PDB file of N, CA, C and O in Angstrom:
ATOM      1  N   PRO E   1      43.292  56.246 -16.134  1.00 60.96           N
ATOM      2  CA  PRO E   1      43.536  57.628 -15.731  1.00 60.96           C
ATOM      3  C   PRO E   1      42.305  58.147 -15.000  1.00 60.96           C
ATOM      4  O   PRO E   1      41.280  57.478 -14.943  1.00 60.96           O
ATOM      5  N   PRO E   2      42.335  59.370 -14.464  1.00 57.74           N
ATOM      6  CA  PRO E   2      41.109  59.939 -13.894  1.00 57.74           C
ATOM      7  C   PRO E   2      39.956  60.013 -14.911  1.00 57.74           C
ATOM      8  O   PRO E   2      40.186  60.186 -16.090  1.00 57.74           O
ATOM      9  N   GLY E   3      38.695  59.908 -14.444  1.00 57.65           N
ATOM     10  CA  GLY E   3      37.500  59.976 -15.287  1.00 57.65           C
ATOM     11  C   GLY E   3      37.196  61.403 -15.745  1.00 57.65           C
ATOM     12  O   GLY E   3      37.974  62.304 -15.449  1.00 57.65           O
ATOM     13  N   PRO E   4      36.114  61.644 -16.524  1.00 56.79           N
ATOM     14  CA  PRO E   4      35.836  62.981 -17.022  1.00 56.79           C
ATOM     15  C   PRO E   4      35.547  63.950 -15.874  1.00 56.79           C
ATOM     16  O   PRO E   4      35.052  63.571 -14.822  1.00 56.79           O
ATOM     17  N   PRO E   5      35.705  65.279 -16.064  1.00 56.24           N
ATOM     18  CA  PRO E   5      35.211  66.234 -15.083  1.00 56.24           C
ATOM     19  C   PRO E   5      33.714  66.041 -14.957  1.00 56.24           C
ATOM     20  O   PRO E   5      33.028  65.639 -15.899  1.00 56.24           O
ATOM     21  N   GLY E   6      33.227  66.374 -13.779  1.00 53.06           N
ATOM     22  CA  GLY E   6      31.795  66.424 -13.603  1.00 53.06           C
ATOM     23  C   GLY E   6      31.113  67.462 -14.507  1.00 53.06           C
ATOM     24  O   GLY E   6      31.755  68.284 -15.141  1.00 53.06           O
ATOM     25  N   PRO E   7      29.767  67.394 -14.593  1.00 57.17           N
ATOM     26  CA  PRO E   7      28.944  68.383 -15.303  1.00 57.17           C
ATOM     27  C   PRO E   7      29.222  69.815 -14.875  1.00 57.17           C
ATOM     28  O   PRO E   7      29.377  70.074 -13.669  1.00 57.17           O
ATOM     29  N   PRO E   8      29.259  70.813 -15.797  1.00 57.13           N
ATOM     30  CA  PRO E   8      29.263  72.208 -15.356  1.00 57.13           C
ATOM     31  C   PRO E   8      28.065  72.509 -14.454  1.00 57.13           C
ATOM     32  O   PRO E   8      27.011  71.897 -14.591  1.00 57.13           O
ATOM     33  N   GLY E   9      28.256  73.459 -13.546  1.00 58.86           N
ATOM     34  CA  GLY E   9      27.112  74.006 -12.840  1.00 58.86           C
ATOM     35  C   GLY E   9      26.256  74.844 -13.779  1.00 58.86           C
ATOM     36  O   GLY E   9      26.736  75.317 -14.810  1.00 58.86           O
ATOM     37  N   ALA E  10      25.020  75.098 -13.399  1.00 60.64           N
ATOM     38  CA  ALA E  10      24.128  76.017 -14.138  1.00 60.64           C
ATOM     39  C   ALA E  10      24.544  77.449 -13.818  1.00 60.64           C
ATOM     40  O   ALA E  10      25.138  77.705 -12.766  1.00 60.64           O
ATOM     41  N   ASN E  11      24.161  78.371 -14.691  1.00 60.19           N
ATOM     42  CA  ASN E  11      24.319  79.800 -14.412  1.00 60.19           C
ATOM     43  C   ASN E  11      23.403  80.206 -13.280  1.00 60.19           C
ATOM     44  O   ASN E  11      22.373  79.604 -13.054  1.00 60.19           O
ATOM     45  N   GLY E  12      23.839  81.233 -12.574  1.00 56.53           N
ATOM     46  CA  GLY E  12      23.088  81.720 -11.422  1.00 56.53           C
ATOM     47  C   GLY E  12      21.756  82.319 -11.860  1.00 56.53           C
ATOM     48  O   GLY E  12      21.558  82.707 -13.021  1.00 56.53           O
ATOM     49  N   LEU E  13      20.852  82.436 -10.893  1.00 57.05           N
ATOM     50  CA  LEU E  13      19.547  83.103 -11.101  1.00 57.05           C
ATOM     51  C   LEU E  13      19.779  84.576 -11.344  1.00 57.05           C
ATOM     52  O   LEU E  13      20.751  85.188 -10.813  1.00 57.05           O
ATOM     53  N   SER E  14      18.849  85.201 -12.028  1.00 55.04           N
ATOM     54  CA  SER E  14      18.806  86.646 -12.110  1.00 55.04           C
ATOM     55  C   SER E  14      18.669  87.267 -10.726  1.00 55.04           C
ATOM     56  O   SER E  14      18.064  86.664  -9.844  1.00 55.04           O
ATOM     57  N   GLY E  15      19.234  88.441 -10.571  1.00 58.54           N
ATOM     58  CA  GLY E  15      19.153  89.136  -9.307  1.00 58.54           C
ATOM     59  C   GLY E  15      17.744  89.528  -8.917  1.00 58.54           C
ATOM     60  O   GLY E  15      16.820  89.559  -9.730  1.00 58.54           O
ATOM     61  N   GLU E  16      17.626  89.929  -7.667  1.00 58.70           N
ATOM     62  CA  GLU E  16      16.389  90.463  -7.116  1.00 58.70           C
ATOM     63  C   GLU E  16      15.967  91.734  -7.855  1.00 58.70           C
ATOM     64  O   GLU E  16      16.784  92.498  -8.313  1.00 58.70           O
ATOM     65  N   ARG E  17      14.677  91.977  -7.921  1.00 55.90           N
ATOM     66  CA  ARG E  17      14.144  93.237  -8.451  1.00 55.90           C
ATOM     67  C   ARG E  17      14.623  94.390  -7.598  1.00 55.90           C
ATOM     68  O   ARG E  17      14.798  94.303  -6.390  1.00 55.90           O
ATOM     69  N   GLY E  18      14.889  95.506  -8.270  1.00 55.51           N
ATOM     70  CA  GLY E  18      15.401  96.722  -7.605  1.00 55.51           C
ATOM     71  C   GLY E  18      14.420  97.299  -6.605  1.00 55.51           C
ATOM     72  O   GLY E  18      13.247  96.975  -6.619  1.00 55.51           O
ATOM     73  N   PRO E  19      14.940  98.207  -5.741  1.00 53.58           N
ATOM     74  CA  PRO E  19      14.098  98.951  -4.816  1.00 53.58           C
ATOM     75  C   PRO E  19      13.028  99.749  -5.525  1.00 53.58           C
ATOM     76  O   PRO E  19      13.104 100.088  -6.699  1.00 53.58           O
ATOM     77  N   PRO E  20      12.013 100.178  -4.767  1.00 56.15           N
ATOM     78  CA  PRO E  20      10.981 101.084  -5.309  1.00 56.15           C
ATOM     79  C   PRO E  20      11.622 102.343  -5.820  1.00 56.15           C
ATOM     80  O   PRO E  20      12.644 102.802  -5.318  1.00 56.15           O
ATOM     81  N   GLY E  21      10.954 102.964  -6.802  1.00 57.02           N
ATOM     82  CA  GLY E  21      11.437 104.273  -7.202  1.00 57.02           C
ATOM     83  C   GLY E  21      11.165 105.361  -6.170  1.00 57.02           C
ATOM     84  O   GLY E  21      10.425 105.150  -5.204  1.00 57.02           O
ATOM     85  N   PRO E  22      11.733 106.536  -6.411  1.00 56.11           N
ATOM     86  CA  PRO E  22      11.511 107.668  -5.513  1.00 56.11           C
ATOM     87  C   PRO E  22      10.043 108.088  -5.521  1.00 56.11           C
ATOM     88  O   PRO E  22       9.335 107.948  -6.526  1.00 56.11           O
ATOM     89  N   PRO E  23       9.568 108.717  -4.447  1.00 51.11           N
ATOM     90  CA  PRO E  23       8.245 109.318  -4.433  1.00 51.11           C
ATOM     91  C   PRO E  23       8.034 110.306  -5.571  1.00 51.11           C
ATOM     92  O   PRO E  23       8.930 111.080  -5.943  1.00 51.11           O
ATOM     93  N   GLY E  24       6.829 110.294  -6.117  1.00 50.45           N
ATOM     94  CA  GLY E  24       6.414 111.229  -7.150  1.00 50.45           C
ATOM     95  C   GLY E  24       6.302 112.665  -6.637  1.00 50.45           C
ATOM     96  O   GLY E  24       6.277 112.898  -5.426  1.00 50.45           O
ATOM     97  N   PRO E  25       6.153 113.619  -7.553  1.00 45.93           N
ATOM     98  CA  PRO E  25       6.096 115.025  -7.190  1.00 45.93           C
ATOM     99  C   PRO E  25       4.725 115.415  -6.698  1.00 45.93           C
ATOM    100  O   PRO E  25       3.706 114.794  -6.983  1.00 45.93           O
ATOM    101  N   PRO E  26       4.681 116.509  -5.936  1.00 42.24           N
ATOM    102  CA  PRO E  26       3.426 117.036  -5.410  1.00 42.24           C
ATOM    103  C   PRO E  26       2.453 117.435  -6.504  1.00 42.24           C
ATOM    104  O   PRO E  26       2.895 117.857  -7.583  1.00 42.24           O
ATOM    105  N   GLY E  27       1.130 117.232  -6.236  1.00 42.81           N
ATOM    106  CA  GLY E  27       0.074 117.652  -7.164  1.00 42.81           C
ATOM    107  C   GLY E  27       0.115 119.113  -7.532  1.00 42.81           C
ATOM    108  O   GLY E  27      -0.444 119.410  -8.608  1.00 42.81           O
TER     109      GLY E  27
ATOM    110  N   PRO P   1      40.979  47.379 -13.627  1.00 45.08           N
ATOM    111  CA  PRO P   1      39.905  48.059 -12.885  1.00 45.08           C
ATOM    112  C   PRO P   1      39.821  49.531 -13.256  1.00 45.08           C
ATOM    113  O   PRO P   1      40.792  50.111 -13.747  1.00 45.08           O
ATOM    114  N   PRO P   2      38.659  50.187 -13.014  1.00 45.88           N
ATOM    115  CA  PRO P   2      38.510  51.603 -13.354  1.00 45.88           C
ATOM    116  C   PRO P   2      39.496  52.520 -12.615  1.00 45.88           C
ATOM    117  O   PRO P   2      39.957  52.235 -11.516  1.00 45.88           O
ATOM    118  N   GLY P   3      39.840  53.623 -13.271  1.00 39.45           N
ATOM    119  CA  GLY P   3      40.609  54.701 -12.684  1.00 39.45           C
ATOM    120  C   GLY P   3      39.836  55.563 -11.656  1.00 39.45           C
ATOM    121  O   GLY P   3      38.701  55.288 -11.282  1.00 39.45           O
ATOM    122  N   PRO P   4      40.511  56.553 -11.050  1.00 39.03           N
ATOM    123  CA  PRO P   4      39.880  57.390 -10.039  1.00 39.03           C
ATOM    124  C   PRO P   4      38.790  58.275 -10.631  1.00 39.03           C
ATOM    125  O   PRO P   4      38.712  58.480 -11.833  1.00 39.03           O
ATOM    126  N   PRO P   5      37.918  58.843  -9.786  1.00 44.02           N
ATOM    127  CA  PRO P   5      36.938  59.805 -10.290  1.00 44.02           C
ATOM    128  C   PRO P   5      37.613  61.009 -10.929  1.00 44.02           C
ATOM    129  O   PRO P   5      38.698  61.377 -10.499  1.00 44.02           O
ATOM    130  N   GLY P   6      36.941  61.598 -11.932  1.00 46.13           N
ATOM    131  CA  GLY P   6      37.360  62.848 -12.522  1.00 46.13           C
ATOM    132  C   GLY P   6      37.211  63.989 -11.530  1.00 46.13           C
ATOM    133  O   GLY P   6      36.658  63.852 -10.407  1.00 46.13           O
ATOM    134  N   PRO P   7      37.783  65.138 -11.887  1.00 46.59           N
ATOM    135  CA  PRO P   7      37.669  66.296 -11.026  1.00 46.59           C
ATOM    136  C   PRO P   7      36.248  66.860 -10.984  1.00 46.59           C
ATOM    137  O   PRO P   7      35.412  66.584 -11.845  1.00 46.59           O
ATOM    138  N   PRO P   8      35.954  67.714 -10.002  1.00 46.55           N
ATOM    139  CA  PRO P   8      34.676  68.390  -9.994  1.00 46.55           C
ATOM    140  C   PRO P   8      34.422  69.190 -11.266  1.00 46.55           C
ATOM    141  O   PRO P   8      35.331  69.781 -11.875  1.00 46.55           O
ATOM    142  N   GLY P   9      33.169  69.257 -11.661  1.00 49.50           N
ATOM    143  CA  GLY P   9      32.796  70.119 -12.765  1.00 49.50           C
ATOM    144  C   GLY P   9      33.085  71.593 -12.512  1.00 49.50           C
ATOM    145  O   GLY P   9      33.165  72.039 -11.348  1.00 49.50           O
ATOM    146  N   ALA P  10      33.050  72.368 -13.577  1.00 47.90           N
ATOM    147  CA  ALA P  10      33.264  73.828 -13.521  1.00 47.90           C
ATOM    148  C   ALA P  10      32.051  74.455 -12.815  1.00 47.90           C
ATOM    149  O   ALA P  10      30.913  74.036 -13.035  1.00 47.90           O
ATOM    150  N   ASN P  11      32.245  75.474 -11.993  1.00 45.66           N
ATOM    151  CA  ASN P  11      31.089  76.196 -11.425  1.00 45.66           C
ATOM    152  C   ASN P  11      30.425  77.033 -12.504  1.00 45.66           C
ATOM    153  O   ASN P  11      30.994  77.349 -13.538  1.00 45.66           O
ATOM    154  N   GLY P  12      29.144  77.205 -12.295  1.00 43.28           N
ATOM    155  CA  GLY P  12      28.333  78.033 -13.183  1.00 43.28           C
ATOM    156  C   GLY P  12      28.758  79.495 -13.079  1.00 43.28           C
ATOM    157  O   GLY P  12      29.404  79.959 -12.139  1.00 43.28           O
ATOM    158  N   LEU P  13      28.363  80.263 -14.053  1.00 41.20           N
ATOM    159  CA  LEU P  13      28.633  81.703 -14.051  1.00 41.20           C
ATOM    160  C   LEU P  13      27.644  82.416 -13.131  1.00 41.20           C
ATOM    161  O   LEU P  13      26.508  81.973 -12.965  1.00 41.20           O
ATOM    162  N   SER P  14      28.025  83.590 -12.657  1.00 36.65           N
ATOM    163  CA  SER P  14      27.101  84.411 -11.858  1.00 36.65           C
ATOM    164  C   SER P  14      25.914  84.839 -12.721  1.00 36.65           C
ATOM    165  O   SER P  14      26.015  85.021 -13.925  1.00 36.65           O
ATOM    166  N   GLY P  15      24.781  84.998 -12.062  1.00 36.68           N
ATOM    167  CA  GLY P  15      23.570  85.450 -12.734  1.00 36.68           C
ATOM    168  C   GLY P  15      23.577  86.904 -13.190  1.00 36.68           C
ATOM    169  O   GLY P  15      24.435  87.696 -12.809  1.00 36.68           O
ATOM    170  N   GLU P  16      22.610  87.205 -14.040  1.00 33.92           N
ATOM    171  CA  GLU P  16      22.527  88.576 -14.567  1.00 33.92           C
ATOM    172  C   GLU P  16      21.858  89.494 -13.542  1.00 33.92           C
ATOM    173  O   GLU P  16      21.198  89.099 -12.584  1.00 33.92           O
ATOM    174  N   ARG P  17      22.058  90.771 -13.765  1.00 32.27           N
ATOM    175  CA  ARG P  17      21.482  91.860 -12.965  1.00 32.27           C
ATOM    176  C   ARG P  17      19.975  91.740 -12.947  1.00 32.27           C
ATOM    177  O   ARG P  17      19.371  91.439 -13.959  1.00 32.27           O
ATOM    178  N   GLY P  18      19.374  91.957 -11.780  1.00 30.67           N
ATOM    179  CA  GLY P  18      17.931  91.905 -11.619  1.00 30.67           C
ATOM    180  C   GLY P  18      17.224  93.060 -12.329  1.00 30.67           C
ATOM    181  O   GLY P  18      17.821  94.032 -12.751  1.00 30.67           O
ATOM    182  N   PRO P  19      15.895  92.925 -12.448  1.00 30.45           N
ATOM    183  CA  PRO P  19      15.111  93.935 -13.159  1.00 30.45           C
ATOM    184  C   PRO P  19      14.947  95.230 -12.371  1.00 30.45           C
ATOM    185  O   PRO P  19      15.088  95.241 -11.149  1.00 30.45           O
ATOM    186  N   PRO P  20      14.558  96.314 -13.038  1.00 31.96           N
ATOM    187  CA  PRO P  20      14.305  97.565 -12.339  1.00 31.96           C
ATOM    188  C   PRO P  20      13.177  97.431 -11.345  1.00 31.96           C
ATOM    189  O   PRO P  20      12.185  96.722 -11.576  1.00 31.96           O
ATOM    190  N   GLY P  21      13.274  98.196 -10.258  1.00 30.30           N
ATOM    191  CA  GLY P  21      12.194  98.269  -9.291  1.00 30.30           C
ATOM    192  C   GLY P  21      10.909  98.875  -9.842  1.00 30.30           C
ATOM    193  O   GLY P  21      10.875  99.461 -10.927  1.00 30.30           O
ATOM    194  N   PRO P  22       9.829  98.736  -9.071  1.00 30.95           N
ATOM    195  CA  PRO P  22       8.557  99.319  -9.484  1.00 30.95           C
ATOM    196  C   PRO P  22       8.584 100.841  -9.416  1.00 30.95           C
ATOM    197  O   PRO P  22       9.417 101.458  -8.749  1.00 30.95           O
ATOM    198  N   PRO P  23       7.644 101.482 -10.123  1.00 29.52           N
ATOM    199  CA  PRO P  23       7.491 102.921  -9.983  1.00 29.52           C
ATOM    200  C   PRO P  23       7.341 103.322  -8.530  1.00 29.52           C
ATOM    201  O   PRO P  23       6.701 102.624  -7.721  1.00 29.52           O
ATOM    202  N   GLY P  24       7.857 104.510  -8.205  1.00 26.01           N
ATOM    203  CA  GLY P  24       7.730 104.998  -6.838  1.00 26.01           C
ATOM    204  C   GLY P  24       6.288 105.322  -6.461  1.00 26.01           C
ATOM    205  O   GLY P  24       5.402 105.371  -7.332  1.00 26.01           O
ATOM    206  N   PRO P  25       6.067 105.621  -5.176  1.00 26.26           N
ATOM    207  CA  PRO P  25       4.747 106.017  -4.717  1.00 26.26           C
ATOM    208  C   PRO P  25       4.284 107.317  -5.353  1.00 26.26           C
ATOM    209  O   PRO P  25       5.107 108.120  -5.745  1.00 26.26           O
ATOM    210  N   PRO P  26       2.975 107.572  -5.393  1.00 27.16           N
ATOM    211  CA  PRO P  26       2.490 108.856  -5.891  1.00 27.16           C
ATOM    212  C   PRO P  26       2.895 109.997  -4.995  1.00 27.16           C
ATOM    213  O   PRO P  26       3.060 109.829  -3.787  1.00 27.16           O
ATOM    214  N   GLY P  27       2.927 111.192  -5.588  1.00 26.41           N
ATOM    215  CA  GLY P  27       3.068 112.433  -4.838  1.00 26.41           C
ATOM    216  C   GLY P  27       1.953 112.730  -3.904  1.00 26.41           C
ATOM    217  O   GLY P  27       0.934 112.027  -3.863  1.00 26.41           O
TER     218      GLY P  27
ATOM    219  N   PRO Y   1      42.043  52.398 -17.306  1.00 28.50           N
ATOM    220  CA  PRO Y   1      41.192  53.304 -18.114  1.00 28.50           C
ATOM    221  C   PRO Y   1      40.651  54.445 -17.252  1.00 28.50           C
ATOM    222  O   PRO Y   1      40.926  54.459 -16.051  1.00 28.50           O
ATOM    223  N   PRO Y   2      39.915  55.447 -17.820  1.00 31.25           N
ATOM    224  CA  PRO Y   2      39.408  56.589 -17.051  1.00 31.25           C
ATOM    225  C   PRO Y   2      38.377  56.169 -16.005  1.00 31.25           C
ATOM    226  O   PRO Y   2      37.519  55.342 -16.263  1.00 31.25           O
ATOM    227  N   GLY Y   3      38.385  56.826 -14.855  1.00 30.80           N
ATOM    228  CA  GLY Y   3      37.384  56.507 -13.853  1.00 30.80           C
ATOM    229  C   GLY Y   3      36.025  57.168 -14.065  1.00 30.80           C
ATOM    230  O   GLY Y   3      35.667  57.709 -15.116  1.00 30.80           O
ATOM    231  N   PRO Y   4      35.195  57.113 -13.023  1.00 31.75           N
ATOM    232  CA  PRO Y   4      33.866  57.713 -13.094  1.00 31.75           C
ATOM    233  C   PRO Y   4      33.917  59.215 -13.287  1.00 31.75           C
ATOM    234  O   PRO Y   4      34.933  59.800 -12.904  1.00 31.75           O
ATOM    235  N   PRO Y   5      32.843  59.842 -13.852  1.00 33.46           N
ATOM    236  CA  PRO Y   5      32.775  61.300 -13.888  1.00 33.46           C
ATOM    237  C   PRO Y   5      32.963  61.861 -12.486  1.00 33.46           C
ATOM    238  O   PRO Y   5      32.472  61.329 -11.502  1.00 33.46           O
ATOM    239  N   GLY Y   6      33.562  63.022 -12.420  1.00 33.70           N
ATOM    240  CA  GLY Y   6      33.634  63.719 -11.158  1.00 33.70           C
ATOM    241  C   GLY Y   6      32.321  64.343 -10.712  1.00 33.70           C
ATOM    242  O   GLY Y   6      31.326  64.334 -11.445  1.00 33.70           O
ATOM    243  N   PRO Y   7      32.310  64.908  -9.496  1.00 33.00           N
ATOM    244  CA  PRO Y   7      31.109  65.557  -8.976  1.00 33.00           C
ATOM    245  C   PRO Y   7      30.636  66.716  -9.820  1.00 33.00           C
ATOM    246  O   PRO Y   7      31.447  67.414 -10.432  1.00 33.00           O
ATOM    247  N   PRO Y   8      29.317  66.996  -9.815  1.00 34.80           N
ATOM    248  CA  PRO Y   8      28.828  68.181 -10.527  1.00 34.80           C
ATOM    249  C   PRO Y   8      29.428  69.465  -9.961  1.00 34.80           C
ATOM    250  O   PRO Y   8      29.752  69.579  -8.785  1.00 34.80           O
ATOM    251  N   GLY Y   9      29.651  70.445 -10.844  1.00 37.36           N
ATOM    252  CA  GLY Y   9      29.962  71.790 -10.390  1.00 37.36           C
ATOM    253  C   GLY Y   9      28.813  72.421  -9.613  1.00 37.36           C
ATOM    254  O   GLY Y   9      27.670  72.069  -9.781  1.00 37.36           O
ATOM    255  N   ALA Y  10      29.120  73.396  -8.781  1.00 40.42           N
ATOM    256  CA  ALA Y  10      28.083  74.196  -8.096  1.00 40.42           C
ATOM    257  C   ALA Y  10      27.462  75.181  -9.087  1.00 40.42           C
ATOM    258  O   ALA Y  10      28.161  75.644 -10.000  1.00 40.42           O
ATOM    259  N   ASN Y  11      26.170  75.479  -8.936  1.00 42.25           N
ATOM    260  CA  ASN Y  11      25.551  76.520  -9.778  1.00 42.25           C
ATOM    261  C   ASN Y  11      26.109  77.908  -9.450  1.00 42.25           C
ATOM    262  O   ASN Y  11      26.693  78.097  -8.365  1.00 42.25           O
ATOM    263  N   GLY Y  12      25.980  78.842 -10.395  1.00 45.21           N
ATOM    264  CA  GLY Y  12      26.481  80.182 -10.123  1.00 45.21           C
ATOM    265  C   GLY Y  12      25.743  80.918  -9.021  1.00 45.21           C
ATOM    266  O   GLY Y  12      24.608  80.561  -8.670  1.00 45.21           O
ATOM    267  N   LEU Y  13      26.387  81.958  -8.489  1.00 45.16           N
ATOM    268  CA  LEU Y  13      25.722  82.807  -7.501  1.00 45.16           C
ATOM    269  C   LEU Y  13      24.697  83.683  -8.217  1.00 45.16           C
ATOM    270  O   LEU Y  13      24.777  83.944  -9.432  1.00 45.16           O
ATOM    271  N   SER Y  14      23.708  84.120  -7.470  1.00 45.65           N
ATOM    272  CA  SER Y  14      22.651  84.990  -8.022  1.00 45.65           C
ATOM    273  C   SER Y  14      23.275  86.311  -8.472  1.00 45.65           C
ATOM    274  O   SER Y  14      24.299  86.773  -7.932  1.00 45.65           O
ATOM    275  N   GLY Y  15      22.626  86.938  -9.435  1.00 44.29           N
ATOM    276  CA  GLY Y  15      23.019  88.255  -9.903  1.00 44.29           C
ATOM    277  C   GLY Y  15      22.761  89.341  -8.906  1.00 44.29           C
ATOM    278  O   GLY Y  15      22.126  89.131  -7.867  1.00 44.29           O
ATOM    279  N   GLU Y  16      23.360  90.474  -9.202  1.00 44.50           N
ATOM    280  CA  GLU Y  16      23.151  91.656  -8.345  1.00 44.50           C
ATOM    281  C   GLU Y  16      21.710  92.129  -8.434  1.00 44.50           C
ATOM    282  O   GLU Y  16      20.989  91.870  -9.424  1.00 44.50           O
ATOM    283  N   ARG Y  17      21.301  92.859  -7.426  1.00 47.21           N
ATOM    284  CA  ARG Y  17      19.953  93.447  -7.408  1.00 47.21           C
ATOM    285  C   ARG Y  17      19.843  94.490  -8.514  1.00 47.21           C
ATOM    286  O   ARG Y  17      20.793  95.215  -8.864  1.00 47.21           O
ATOM    287  N   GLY Y  18      18.659  94.571  -9.096  1.00 46.71           N
ATOM    288  CA  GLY Y  18      18.377  95.578 -10.107  1.00 46.71           C
ATOM    289  C   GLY Y  18      18.358  96.995  -9.561  1.00 46.71           C
ATOM    290  O   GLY Y  18      18.425  97.243  -8.339  1.00 46.71           O
ATOM    291  N   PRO Y  19      18.263  97.984 -10.450  1.00 49.84           N
ATOM    292  CA  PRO Y  19      18.296  99.382 -10.021  1.00 49.84           C
ATOM    293  C   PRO Y  19      16.961  99.803  -9.441  1.00 49.84           C
ATOM    294  O   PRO Y  19      15.916  99.186  -9.694  1.00 49.84           O
ATOM    295  N   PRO Y  20      16.967 100.877  -8.625  1.00 49.46           N
ATOM    296  CA  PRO Y  20      15.689 101.452  -8.172  1.00 49.46           C
ATOM    297  C   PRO Y  20      14.795 101.770  -9.339  1.00 49.46           C
ATOM    298  O   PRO Y  20      15.268 102.162 -10.404  1.00 49.46           O
ATOM    299  N   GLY Y  21      13.507 101.700  -9.084  1.00 48.75           N
ATOM    300  CA  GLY Y  21      12.514 102.069 -10.097  1.00 48.75           C
ATOM    301  C   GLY Y  21      12.482 103.553 -10.388  1.00 48.75           C
ATOM    302  O   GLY Y  21      13.205 104.347  -9.778  1.00 48.75           O
ATOM    303  N   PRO Y  22      11.640 103.957 -11.334  1.00 49.66           N
ATOM    304  CA  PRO Y  22      11.540 105.361 -11.740  1.00 49.66           C
ATOM    305  C   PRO Y  22      10.692 106.121 -10.741  1.00 49.66           C
ATOM    306  O   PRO Y  22       9.921 105.537  -9.975  1.00 49.66           O
ATOM    307  N   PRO Y  23      10.768 107.461 -10.762  1.00 49.79           N
ATOM    308  CA  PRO Y  23       9.940 108.283  -9.857  1.00 49.79           C
ATOM    309  C   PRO Y  23       8.449 108.026 -10.051  1.00 49.79           C
ATOM    310  O   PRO Y  23       7.966 107.788 -11.182  1.00 49.79           O
ATOM    311  N   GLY Y  24       7.723 108.100  -8.941  1.00 47.32           N
ATOM    312  CA  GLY Y  24       6.293 107.894  -8.955  1.00 47.32           C
ATOM    313  C   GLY Y  24       5.546 109.012  -9.676  1.00 47.32           C
ATOM    314  O   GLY Y  24       6.103 110.027 -10.067  1.00 47.32           O
ATOM    315  N   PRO Y  25       4.245 108.799  -9.893  1.00 46.37           N
ATOM    316  CA  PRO Y  25       3.431 109.775 -10.587  1.00 46.37           C
ATOM    317  C   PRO Y  25       3.172 110.986  -9.677  1.00 46.37           C
ATOM    318  O   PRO Y  25       3.294 110.932  -8.450  1.00 46.37           O
ATOM    319  N   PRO Y  26       2.739 112.107 -10.290  1.00 45.33           N
ATOM    320  CA  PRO Y  26       2.379 113.284  -9.520  1.00 45.33           C
ATOM    321  C   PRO Y  26       1.160 113.024  -8.687  1.00 45.33           C
ATOM    322  O   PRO Y  26       0.293 112.228  -9.030  1.00 45.33           O
ATOM    323  N   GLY Y  27       1.045 113.762  -7.594  1.00 45.26           N
ATOM    324  CA  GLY Y  27      -0.196 113.727  -6.829  1.00 45.26           C
ATOM    325  C   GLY Y  27      -1.393 114.338  -7.533  1.00 45.26           C
ATOM    326  O   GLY Y  27      -1.259 114.953  -8.640  1.00 45.26           O
TER     327      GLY Y  27
END
């Protein structure tokens, strides 16, 4: 019969770090 | 003689959400 | 009998980008 399924793939990488936060408030 | 190759393995799951961005620029 | 293992699965896609960072410090 057909052989075993191949190995599962690995889980994906974590996403990219988010954008910078908003500018802080005036002094 | 041996049978046919098995099917392709399962694809991996999508990765997790990326980390928060850095603090914003100063005021 | 069963044939060779099938091809490896593809790895998962990368996760979504993280959220924007927090507001910056005061001036």
